[PDB]
């Protein structure tokens, strides 16, 4: 036995099927188009901020499948003063650490925030390279207001001021602060 | 390294007889030294050697050991 | 727009009440591993919405309620509200209850997050960065490095958007299964 109730059901399924296709296609269609308008502006400024925090070198953005903007990976090529050009699986561990750094801040530049708070992301630095990460937050902090959590003294040093929390008593954290400028 | 810092504030403390201003604790300091004297004293409160007061946000700072 | 003051009291390790005035430069925030510094990110974490209370040491109790503000400069309309300076307050007591407020006005978290997602600064903006971000490009999974070019993209709202239309579709086709099912069985 055939009921109408079941039969309306059907058809409201094959209609919601038609107008929904239609938004899962275009959503397709959106990430494709903003992921790989948003790949070429961060690959516009990366070499350039690699080179700022390394102190030289070069690097290179690639898409592992440009053909599928869906899913592609992207590579990441990177030669460190002195060193060889590699990919980022075979560079040191400090290297690594200051190149992920340098994808992060070409994204800032594509994809500005008036503050940033930089939670200790500079741990895995090579300390030879750490004065070069905190004078590169100096000079942008002119147009990004940096709050920068660090255990590292040569971002200490480039800081205008300085917040020191320590439990003077036990699981208690107090708070004092110098200025440095 | 803070230790060799934190150990010049104890001294500096002990011949001193009560508080220090944090800016006289060493008569000048560049600015790679103030970090590190100002690790020194977080440090030091942690340890409970050092007493520490500050009225607000970039105040002066008044230190004194603990005995 | 730029961070004024983060006032924090019962949060985690903030037994007594915290207030740090923020520079528009470089501040930086330092002191012995462990004895807090992190906390002050999971108070401006918390505090824009996305084991609170203070749980005791040996001179003192667990408190019953945590809270803390950020207050904003607004002077260029960044956030869109009319304000010349925002307050965001998210407060939550020992019993579960949570309260929040902006400029002082309850309202709901909802309103927090809508607040800076509209302003540009949602899930997606690297306004917080911590080492997990290192480590999501670092990763030897391309999908996980992937992730991090699809936030500075923006596609959170079109993914979210397109799951939820194929999930309607499934649950639709799901239904009308039952209801078939259902139907046989009475045959």
Same mark, same amino acid.
């Given at each position: 036995?055939?009921?109408?109730?079941?039969?309306?059901?059907?058809?409201?399924?094959?209609?919601?099927?038609?107008?929904?296709?239609?938004?899962?296609?275009?959503?397709?269609?959106?990430?494709?188009?903003?992921?790989?308008?948003?790949?070429?502006?961060?690959?516009?400024?990366?070499?350039?901020?690699?080179?700022?925090?390394?102190?030289?070198?070069?690097?290179?953005? *690639?898409?592992?499948?440009?053909?599928?903007?869906?899913?592609?990976?992207?590579?990441?090529?990177?030669?460190?003063?002195?060193?060889?050009?590699?990919?980022?699986?075979?560079?040191?561990?400090?290297? *690594?650490?200051?190149?992920?750094?340098?994808?992060?801040?070409?994204?800032?530049?594509? *994809?500005?925030?008036?503050?940033?708070?930089?939670?200790?992301?500079?741990?895995?630095?090579?300390?030879?390279?750490?004065?070069?990460?905190?004078?590169?937050?100096?000079?942008?902090?002119?147009?990004?207001?940096?709050?920068?959590?660090?255990? *590292?003294?040569?971002?200490?040093?480039?800081?205008?001021?300085?917040?020191?929390?320590?439990?003077?008593?036990?699981?208690?954290?107090?708070?004092?602060?110098?200025?440095?400028? | +390294?803070?230790?060799?810092?934190?150990?010049?504030?104890?001294?500096?403390?002990?011949?001193?007889?009560?508080?220090?201003? $944090?800016?006289?604790? $060493? +008569?000048?300091?560049?600015?790679?030294?103030?970090?590190?004297?100002?690790?020194?004293?977080?440090?030091?409160?942690?340890?409970?050697?050092?007493?520490?007061?500050?009225?607000?946000? $970039?105040?002066?700072?008044?230190?004194?050991?603990?005995? | 727009? /730029?961070?004024?003051?983060?006032?924090?009291?019962? /949060?985690?390790?903030?037994?007594?009440?915290?207030?740090?005035?923020?520079?528009?430069?470089?501040?930086?925030?330092?002191?012995?591993?462990?004895?807090?510094?992190?906390?002050?990110?999971?108070?401006?974490?918390?505090?824009?919405?996305?084991?609170?209370? /203070?749980?005791?040491?040996?001179?003192?109790?667990?408190?019953?309620?945590?809270?803390?503000?950020?207050?904003?400069?607004?002077?260029?309309?960044?956030?869109?509200?009319?304000?010349?300076?925002?307050?965001?307050?998210?407060?939550?007591?020992?019993?579960?209850?949570? !309260? /929040?407020?902006?400029?002082?006005?309850?309202?709901?978290?909802?309103?927090?997050?809508?607040?800076?997602?509209?302003?540009?600064?949602?899930? !997606?903006?690297?306004?917080?960065?911590?080492?997990?971000?290192?480590?999501?490009?670092?990763?030897?999974?391309?999908?996980?490095?992937?992730?991090?070019?699809? !936030?500075?993209?923006?596609?959170?709202?079109?993914?979210?958007?397109?799951?939820?239309?194929?999930?309607?579709?499934?649950?639709?086709?799901?239904?009308?299964?039952?209801?078939?099912?259902?139907?046989? !069985?009475?045959?």
């Amino acid at each position: 036995m055939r009921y109408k109730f079941l039969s309306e059901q059907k058809e409201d399924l094959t209609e919601a099927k038609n107008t929904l296709f239609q938004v899962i296609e275009e959503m397709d269609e959106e990430m494709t188009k903003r992921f790989n308008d948003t790949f070429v502006q961060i690959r516009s400024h990366f070499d350039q901020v690699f080179r700022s925090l390394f102190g030289g070198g070069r690097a290179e953005l *690639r898409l592992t499948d440009p053909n599928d903007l869906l899913h592609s990976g992207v590579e990441i090529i990177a030669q460190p003063p002195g060193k060889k050009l590699q990919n980022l699986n075979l560079l040191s561990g400090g290297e *690594r650490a200051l190149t992920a750094i340098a994808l992060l801040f070409s994204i800032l530049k594509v *994809r500005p925030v008036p503050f940033c708070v930089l939670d200790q992301v500079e741990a895995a630095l090579d300390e030879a390279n750490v004065f070069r990460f905190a004078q590169y937050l100096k000079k942008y902090s002119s147009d990004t207001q940096f709050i920068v959590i660090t255990h *590292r003294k040569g971002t200490m040093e480039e800081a205008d001021v300085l917040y020191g929390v320590t439990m003077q008593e036990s699981g208690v954290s107090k708070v004092i602060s110098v200025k440095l400028e | +390294p803070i230790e060799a810092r934190m150990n010049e504030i104890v001294h500096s403390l002990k011949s001193r007889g009560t508080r220090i201003n $944090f800016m006289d604790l $060493f +008569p000048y300091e560049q600015k790679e030294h103030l970090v590190v004297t100002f690790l020194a004293v977080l440090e030091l409160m942690k340890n409970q050697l050092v007493l520490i007061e500050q009225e607000h946000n $970039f105040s002066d700072i008044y230190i004194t050991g603990s005995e | 727009m /730029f961070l004024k003051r983060l006032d924090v009291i019962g /949060f985690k390790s903030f037994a007594e009440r915290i207030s740090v005035d923020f520079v528009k430069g470089v501040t930086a925030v330092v002191g012995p591993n462990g004895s807090g510094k992190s906390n002050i990110t999971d108070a401006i974490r918390w505090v824009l919405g996305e084991d609170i209370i /203070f749980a005791g040491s040996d001179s003192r109790k667990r408190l019953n309620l945590a809270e803390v503000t950020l207050t904003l400069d607004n002077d260029d309309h960044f956030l869109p509200i009319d304000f010349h300076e925002v307050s965001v307050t998210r407060r939550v007591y020992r019993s579960g209850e949570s !309260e /929040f407020l902006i400029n002082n006005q309850p309202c709901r978290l909802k309103d927090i997050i809508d607040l800076f997602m509209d302003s540009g600064l949602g899930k !997606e903006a690297f306004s917080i960065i911590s080492q997990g971000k290192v480590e999501e490009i670092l990763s030897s999974k391309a999908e996980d490095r992937r992730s991090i070019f699809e !936030e500075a993209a923006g596609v959170l709202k079109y993914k979210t958007r397109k799951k939820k239309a194929e999930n309607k579709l499934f649950e639709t086709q799901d239904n009308l299964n039952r209801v078939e099912d259902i139907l046989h !069985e009475l045959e």
